[PDB]
Amino acid sequence: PLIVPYNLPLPGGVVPRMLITILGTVKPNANRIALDFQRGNDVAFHFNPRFNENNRRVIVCNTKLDNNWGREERQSVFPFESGKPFKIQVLVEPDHFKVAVNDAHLLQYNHRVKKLNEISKLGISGDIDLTSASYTMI
Ligand SMILES: Cc1ccc(S[C@@H]2O[C@H](CO)[C@H](O)[C@H](n3cc(-c4c(F)c(F)c(N)c(F)c4F)nn3)[C@H]2O)cc1
């Protein structure tokens, strides 16, 4: 198992047609997962499944610039289940990050940080056992 939090360098940043695949298992009684695509200290794309926000499960997405969070984008479709193995695929497209979970499209997140070649880290954090984190070009 990989250490969590996990730092996956993305050399030279991201580019359209780059596919990032995260395989893991959600812990029992999970509270949160986070993927953080970072441009230095900024978070270009934060993808944050919350298992218990006011007793509801929701995905919160946002960007952090100069240490300030922006407007949240929320997805109530929630494909993660405590205790179960998952696959997150993040496909970089020209205008957005496209996220599929367990081979089913979940959401798109329009690029707010525009210097894709500077988004050169993926952090993976939260209540998972992490099996693999990798990328490839499609
Ligand atoms: C005024 C105001 C009031 C409340 C908020 S809440 C804020 O909302 C953001 C999305 O808009 C992010 O979710 C933030 N956030 C979550 C994590 C985090 C973490 F630190 C971890 F260690 C793990 N393991 C994890 F899964 C995480 F998600 N870090 N920063 C959250 O603090 C904002 C503004």
Swiss-Prot record:
A motif (Nuclear export signal) lies at residues 114-129. One of its GO terms (molecular function) is carbohydrate binding. One of its GO terms (biological process) is positive regulation of mononuclear cell migration. The modification Phosphoserine is found at residue 76. Residues 6-136 form the Galectin domain. A major expression is found in the colonic epithelium. It is also abundant in the activated macrophages. Expressed in fetal membranes. Keywords: Acetylation, Cytoplasm, Differentiation, Disulfide bond, IgE-binding protein, Immunity, Innate immunity, Lectin, mRNA processing, mRNA splicing, Nucleus, Phosphoprotein, Repeat, Secreted, Spliceosome. It is found in: Cytoplasm; Nucleus; Secreted. A beta-D-galactoside binds at residues 69-75. One of its GO terms (cellular component) is immunological synapse. Galactose-specific lectin which binds IgE. May mediate with the alpha-3, beta-1 integrin the stimulation by CSPG4 of endothelial cells migration. Together with DMBT1, required for terminal differentiation of columnar epithelial cells during early embryogenesis. In the nucleus: acts as a pre-mRNA splicing factor. Involved in acute inflammatory responses including neutrophil activation and adhesion, chemoattraction of monocytes macrophages, opsonization of apoptotic neutrophils, and activation of mast cells. Probably forms homo- or heterodimers. Interacts with DMBT1. Interacts with CD6 and ALCAM. Forms a complex with the ITGA3, ITGB1 and CSPG4. Interacts with LGALS3BP, LYPD3, ZFTRAF1 and UACA. Interacts with TRIM16; this interaction mediates autophagy of damage endomembranes. Interacts with cargo receptor TMED10; the interaction mediates the translocation from the cytoplasm into the ERGIC (endoplasmic reticulum-Golgi intermediate compartment) and thereby secretion. This is Galectin-3. It comes from Homo sapiens. The chain holds residues 113 to 250 of 250 of the full protein.
